[PDB]
Every structure is written in structure tokens, then in C-alpha cells.
Design a protein around this ligand. Structure first.
Ligand SMILES: NC(=O)C1=CN([C@@H]2O[C@H](COP(=O)(O)OP(=O)(O)OC[C@H]3O[C@@H](n4cnc5c(N)ncnc54)[C@H](OP(=O)(O)O)[C@@H]3O)[C@@H](O)[C@H]2O)C=CC1
Ligand SMILES: N[C@@H](CCC(=O)O)C(=O)O
Ligand SMILES: O=C(O)CCC(=O)C(=O)O
Length: 417
């Protein structure tokens, strides 16, 4: 049923087919450099002891310490962790961070655990994987069903074990502001998406002031993308959507009022002055920027032709299928690859790690400007590769990331060819 690691390896081979890479380097990149599977025992609230399965996969560390989150899902598998670590490698390589690829996970349903049990689980996971993590070895991060509270617990346990012999704040990112946290973490993904959209408009020669944007999904990423677009880029937000449905208004939407209505009516539907539309119908609107910030695979071969957006900002994690990719490219529409558009979160986590390591913490403006520089440089590199190699933007981003990792490997002497 299309194993995640098989899919990742196929993606890597496809990317290697568009660039000059040696066979030994490809074989090295097809396998994670270190996989750690540990037992995570905790004491239940009823006094019993339960053992959970924890993972920590470090795909590659040629460019520096590995970076990646920890998932707490009942359906976690070592294959999924390996695939996500492989993808995290390219995610940190495309935006030029001194990081490798890493990922963790515990096979547990956190909906049935109390606060004390969750804290015990985090501390036991740290005790189990201490020997393969560190400020300069492996930096975990929040992921699905994991939050900054668990980050604080993990950091505290790591500091307790390490005996405060170094920057224990920098061992993990996504921490609360009170303990080594960073500013701008809430709006990192949306800010990166906005910078990439601005650069794409600059590349296409389109002035965004007075244009239209449609956003699918109105969670944290979608709402902040719409709000930041309207604020900075001056783009008129004409359509937003949630799981229940979507709304449309050619005169424009106010993101704050829409958020208030969603937080009051439980959904964005039936917003005053707005016409109710379906998600599929939102994908059909004639806009200049489309930002899918929702479930995977919303653009398929069926509806790829009927898309009228000039720029498709893949804020979510792969909302466009390869057939849809080819169809959309044929229509002369610029796509911003998913792991380049939403690279703001990992970039801001890197900024947090830098602040923790240095012992000096920045402000909201400094973080915003550094993120702006990083996203602009990454998008311009990807677009230049796209224009030079006459390939898809996703293929160009993969080529850039794999080339950076391959050059780092060659410089270390790991591969001689
Ligand atoms: N936000 C972040 O920090 C980062 C985000 N990403 C990626 O970004 C996207 C969104 O992130 P995030 O804000 O955390 O997500 P959220 O869980 O906070 O919100 C999800 C939003 O998308 C909607 N949604 C879920 N399924 C559908 C669907 N089938 N159709 C239409 N709308 C749907 C939800 O609707 P409803 O409210 O009704 O449930 C909600 O509006 C994801 O694809 C994620 O992978 C990854 C990098 C970090
Ligand atoms: N797993 C999250 C956290 C970022 C990080 O790995 O530092 C992401 O990929 O965005
Ligand atoms: O894995 C991540 O970094 C985020 C994934 C996510 O937010 C999602 O799947 O909804």
C-alpha cells in the first residue's frame, strides 16, 4: 500500500534523475545513517507500568546536527519516521540551514493519557534517547499531537541528565518563551509563505497590491496566511474555507472577523455578506494567488486543468499530485513547492536554536527580517534552477537540496565520487 519509505526513496531517485550524482552517493542517501528504536516505560496513574515503542531516526548529518520533530500517534511506524526524516533532510537543505535530517516518534494514543502520564512519557523518551541527541547532535521539535509543553518537559529532563554542562536550552526547539523560547514561532509558516509569494510575484512581474487570493483551510497556517497577505502584500482575501465548507466575497474578507465568527459559530460558513461555496468551488475561482493550507492531495488530475490561479502557494504538505503538477506547469502557472513554501517553521526553529546556543535572544523584527532574507534567497535559488534546467519547480527544489547534501558529503570525504 505504497510504503512511506518506498515513496521517499522513489522521490529521491526521481530527483537524482535530473542531476549529476554518483551511484555511491545515491546509495548513501537511500539509507538513514542511524536508526534508534527504544522502549519507553512509564508508570500509569493506576500504578501499573506500560512500555511504549519510541523511535529516533537520523537520516543524514553531513551539513550539521540533525533536525526534526517527534510524533505521538497510535499509528506510528518506523517506516513513517524514516520517510519523514528523509524529507526533513531536504527541507533543511533547500533553505540552506546547517542541519541534517532527523525524526522521532512514540506509538501511543495521547488522547487517553493524563497530564502526569504525558510528562512521564516525555521524560522517559528523553532518558531513552539521551545518548543520540544533543545541542550539536540532534534537535527535536514539536509535531503531530505534541506541543511546547512537552518540549519544556523534555528540555527539563535533558538538562537534569546533562547536569547543566552546556546549552541545554538548545537541545530542543518549540519551547515556551519563559524557557528558551523564540518570538515569531506562531506565524512562522505563514510568514515564510508570504515572503515566497511576494518573491514569486516579483519573478512573474505582478504587483500584488489590489489582487485576489483564495486560501483553503483556515487553521493556524491558513488564517495567518490570509491575514499576513492582506496586511503586508495588500492582497484582497476573497475566499476562505474550513472542513465544513467555504465562503466567497468579491469585495473582500476581514480575516479577524472571519476568525471571530469561526470561533463563535464553530465554522467559517454562513459568514455575513459572504456566499457559501464548496472547497472544490474555491479551487475553481479566478484568483492570482491560491494557498492550499489544508488536507493533502486537494489538487489532482481531475481538477488540475480547471485551476485559474497564477501562483499556487503549497502552504500545506503536498496538496498537488505529480499529474496535477505536470498539468499545472503546462498551463503556464508557477508553483511554489510544498517543502519550500512552508519552510518558515523549520527556519524559525533554527533561529530559536541559534538564540539558545548564543545565549542572546532576538526580537520580533529581527526574526522577521532574517526569515525574510532566508526565504528570499531560497526561493530565488530554486527559481534560478527552475529556469536554467527547464524542469518543474518541485524538481528544481529537490535538485538544490540534494546538491547541497551531496556537496557536503563530498567535502567531508564520505563519498569519493
Ligand atoms: N501551522 C504550522 O505551524 C505548520 C503547518 N504545516 C502544514 O500546514 C497545514 C495547516 O497547518 P495547521 O494550521 O497546523 O493545521 P490546523 O490543524 O491548525 O488547521 C487545519 C485547517 O484545515 C482545515 N481542514 C482539515 N481538513 C480539511 C479538508 N479535508 N478540507 C478543507 N479544510 C480542511 C481545518 O478545518 P476545521 O477548522 O474545520 O477543522 C482547519 O481549518 C497542514 O497541511 C500542515 O501539514 C506544517 C508546518 C508547520
Ligand atoms: N517537525 C516540524 C518542526 C520543525 C523542526 O523540525 O525543527 C517541521 O518540520 O516544521
Ligand atoms: O509534520 C509537520 O511538520 C506538520 C504536519 C501537520 O501539521 C499536519 O500533518 O497537519
Amino acid at each position: 500500500e505504497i510504503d512511506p519509505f518506498e515513496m521517499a526513496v522513489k522521490q529521491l531517485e526521481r530527483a537524482a534523475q535530473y542531476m549529476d550524482i554518483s551511484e555511491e552517493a545515491l546509495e548513501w542517501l537511500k539509507k538513514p545513517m542511524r536508526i534508534v528504536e527504544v522502549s519507553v516505560p512509564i508508570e500509569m496513574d493506576d500504578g501499573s507500568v506500560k512500555v511504549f515503542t519510541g523511535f529516533r531516526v537520523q537520516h543524514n548529518w553531513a551539513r550539521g546536527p540533525t533536525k526534526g520533530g517527534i510524533r505521538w500517534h497510535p499509528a506510528e511506524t518506523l517506516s513513517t519516521v524514516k520517510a519523514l526524516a528523509t524529507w526533513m533532510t531536504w527541507k533543511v537543505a533547500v533553505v540552506d540551514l546547517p542541519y541534517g535530517g532527523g525524526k522521532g516518534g512514540i506509538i501511543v494514543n495521547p488522547k487517553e493519557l493524563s497530564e502526569r502520564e504525558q510528562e512521564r512519557l516525555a521524560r522517559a523518551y528523553i532518558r531513552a534517547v539521551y545518548d543520540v541527541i544533543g545541542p550539536w547532535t540532534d534537535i527535536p521539535a514539536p509535531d503531530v499531537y505534541t506541543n511546547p509543553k512537552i518540549m519544556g518537559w523534555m528540555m527539563d529532563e535533558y538538562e537534569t541528565i546533562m547536569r547543566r554542562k552546556g546549552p541545554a536550552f538548545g537541545v530542543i526547539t518549540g519551547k515556551p518563551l519563559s524557557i528558551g523560547g523564540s518570538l515569531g514561532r506562531g506565524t512562522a509558516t505563514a510568514q515564510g509563505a508570504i515572503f515566497t509569494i511576494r518573491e514569486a510575484a516579483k519573478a512573474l512581474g505582478i504587483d500584488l497590491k489590489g489582487k485576489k487570493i483564495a486560501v483553503q483551510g483556515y487553521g493556524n497556517a491558513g488564517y495567518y496566511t490570509a491575514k499576513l497577505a492582506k496586511e503586508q502584500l495588500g492582497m484582497t482575501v476573497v475566499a476562505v474555507s474550513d472542513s465544513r465548507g467555504g465562503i466567497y466575497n468579491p469585495d473582500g474578507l476581514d480575516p479577524d472577523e472571519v476568525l471571530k465568527w469561526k470561533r463563535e459559530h464553530g465554522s467559517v460558513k454562513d459568514f455575513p455578506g459572504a456566499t457559501n461555496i464548496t472547497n472544490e468551488e474555491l479551487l475553481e475561482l479566478e484568483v492570482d494567488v491560491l494557498a492550499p493550507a489544508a488536507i493533502e492531495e486537494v489538487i489532482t488530475e481531475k481538477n488540475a486543468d480547471n485551476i485559474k490561479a497564477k501562483i499556487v502557494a503549497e502552504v500545506a504538505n503536498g496538496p498537488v499530485t505529480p499529474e496535477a503538477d505536470d498539468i499545472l506547469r503546462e498551463k503556464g502557472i508557477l508553483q511554489i513547492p510544498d517543502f519550500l513554501c512552508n519552510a518558515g517553521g523549520v527556519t524559525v526553529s533554527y533561529f530559536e536554536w541559534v538564540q539558545n546556543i548564543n545565549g542572546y535572544y532576538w526580537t520580533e523584527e529581527e526574526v522577521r527580517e532574517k526569515l525574510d532574507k532566508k526565504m528570499t534567497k531560497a526561493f530565488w535559488e530554486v527559481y534560478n534552477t527552475h529556469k536554467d534546467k527547464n524542469i518543474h519547480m518541485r524538481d528544481a527544489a529537490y535538485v538544490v537540496a540534494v546538491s547541497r547534501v551531496y556537496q557536503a558529503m563530498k567535502d567531508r570525504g564520505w563519498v569519493k565520487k
